[PDB]
Amino acid sequence: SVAHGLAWSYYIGYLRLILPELQARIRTYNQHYNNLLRGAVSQRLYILLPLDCGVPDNLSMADPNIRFLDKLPQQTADRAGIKDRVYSNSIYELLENGQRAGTCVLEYATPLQTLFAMSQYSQAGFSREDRLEQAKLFCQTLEDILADAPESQNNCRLIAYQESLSQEVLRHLRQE
Amino acid sequence: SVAHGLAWSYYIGYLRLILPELQARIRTYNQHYNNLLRGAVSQRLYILLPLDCGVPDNLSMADPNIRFLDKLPQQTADRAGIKDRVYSNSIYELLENGQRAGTCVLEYATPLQTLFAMSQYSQAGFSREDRLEQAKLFCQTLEDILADAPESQNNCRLIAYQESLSQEVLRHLRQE
């Protein structure tokens, strides 16, 4: 199916390439700024999975209690003929009553934007019914993949939601 | 199908985002070095589509007559919560009898690597027969998409091949 391929490609072409070196990038960042407690960037990449497939480019649109703090220093690798293909990732502060309550690397799973766009292009032959069903299947397949993936054990957290996003991220950050 | 989703996501999530600003990046690069004639970087992104799905990270492995020259200055854009997500692309020289015969931005279509890996993972439930059939369908769907795409008219060239790659790229570079 469309979602099956998308979940496998997101893992193979992106998560499996960035997750093994993520915790070293986070450790280097936290150690540089001596971040401890709430200011310490979480050891996991937090992946937003909106079931409605609405993927905005600016997170401080979905919730004002989610504030951009810094870029995580880039990872580079030679990839498919791109010399030093750059992997950029952003650190956000999660606010509660105006103060920093948590810190984490956060981004949306871009294949969910593909499902939304496919439902809008006539040549994709993909309905709004297909979009919602394939969004659920994408999330489930990705969960199944990451459960067994050797690169992705203790450094990734999926956040699926339907329509407070900051409270939800903080719920996850607090558990650990 | 798996290939249908991959071709649409490669277009939606990558080509449609980089192709509108590609020719300005190439123009700025050529103008900086006053590149004219064979040394002028082609106005099109050349996308390698190996039908066997073998995607190496270093192009100077597939053919020695393909030599890395320079990185095209990066494009950045806010994307899915990644502030200034970086789009890196590499310029290659295509050699003929030891001399530079052509110059172009070149890379492999990474979703073809996903098909190869999916055929190797038991949980993907995807055979070697599925890989070859879906590789052909990916190439065909991508060709169909780019034919009508408003962002991708005169700035992209697909190079599908089965097993000289340099001669094939040069065949395309010479036509224009």
Ligand SMILES: COc1cc2cc(C(=O)CCC(=O)O)sc2cc1OC
């Ligand atoms: C769905 O397949 C892919 C997703 C994905 C996301 C990638 C990212 O860099 C995440 C941010 C973005 O989509 O720009 S690379 C990649 C490659 C894929 O297949 C080869």
Ligand SMILES: COc1cc2cc(C(=O)CCC(=O)O)sc2cc1OC
């Ligand atoms: C197959 O779907 C995608 C492919 C792709 C390739 C991307 C690239 O940056 C090309 C180089 C690479 O794969 O690292 S971004 C991207 C996003 C996709 O879906 C959201």
